[PDB]
Amino acid sequence: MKLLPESLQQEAATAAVVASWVLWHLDTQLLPTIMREHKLHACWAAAAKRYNEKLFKLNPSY
Amino acid sequence: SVLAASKMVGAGCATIALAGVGAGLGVMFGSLINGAARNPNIAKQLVGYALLGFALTESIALFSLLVVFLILFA
């Protein structure tokens, strides 16, 4: 049993590579998709009242 | 091999700090039970504090164990 590895810098660079890939994949592939779903639902839920009142005012059918 | 003998003796004397950290951790978890009994409406908040508290408390155990490793396998 050894505490230290063969190279501390190699393991540190492995951690940096893995975490930087998780950062790029999060910011680039995951967070656009997440925010497309979330901001569609949130924009509709935040604008339902104003949207329906504006469309009710525009609608000449009544 | 008097150095390795003292390594075994020193690691066995080194892990005494786990007693104090276990007594403190049990005090903190018993207070978590108490604080959930006082006000359960915020209980899922309190457990979070407990975990965070356990977190920092656990670190005092690991700085013990690290010294044990620094005694045993350095």
Partner: protein
């Protein structure tokens, strides 16, 4: 691919009065969204076969290195102790409740879409 409602309008205006009630179902089926039917079941993907063969090669390589190791038998028994928990998680975890809990984690799936109402966008 044009507007489907514009196709509904053109197809309804293009029919005669005698043909309208007969052709309403076909005008409905023409401007209805494509839900693509199930294709023929094929082989596994290139990436799926790469994943399975790479997982098997990693498992074999790690089991070989665990055999070569100094405390080899406790390595091969740690594998049994971990596979036991992977077995017991398939039996313990309430996967329907876990699915709906994760659905509650995101606000997009926690509630229904509250958006356009019918009375605002009606056209008499």
């Amino acid at each position: 691919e044009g507007n489907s409602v514009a196709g509904i309008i053109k197809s309804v205006n293009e029919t005669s009065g005698a043909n309208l009630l007969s052709s309403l179902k076909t005008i409905k089926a023409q401007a209805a969204p494509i839900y693509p039917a199930a294709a023929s079941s094929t082989g596994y993907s290139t990436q799926a076969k790469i994943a399975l063969f790479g997982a098997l090669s990693w498992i074999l390589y790690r089991a070989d290195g665990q055999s070569k190791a100094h405390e080899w038998i406790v390595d091969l028994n740690l594998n049994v102790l971990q596979a036991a928990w992977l077995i017991s998680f398939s039996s313990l975890i309430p996967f329907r409740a876990v699915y709906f809990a994760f659905r509650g984690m995101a606000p997009a799936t926690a509630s229904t879409l509250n958006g356009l109402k019918t009375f605002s966008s009606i056209s008499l």
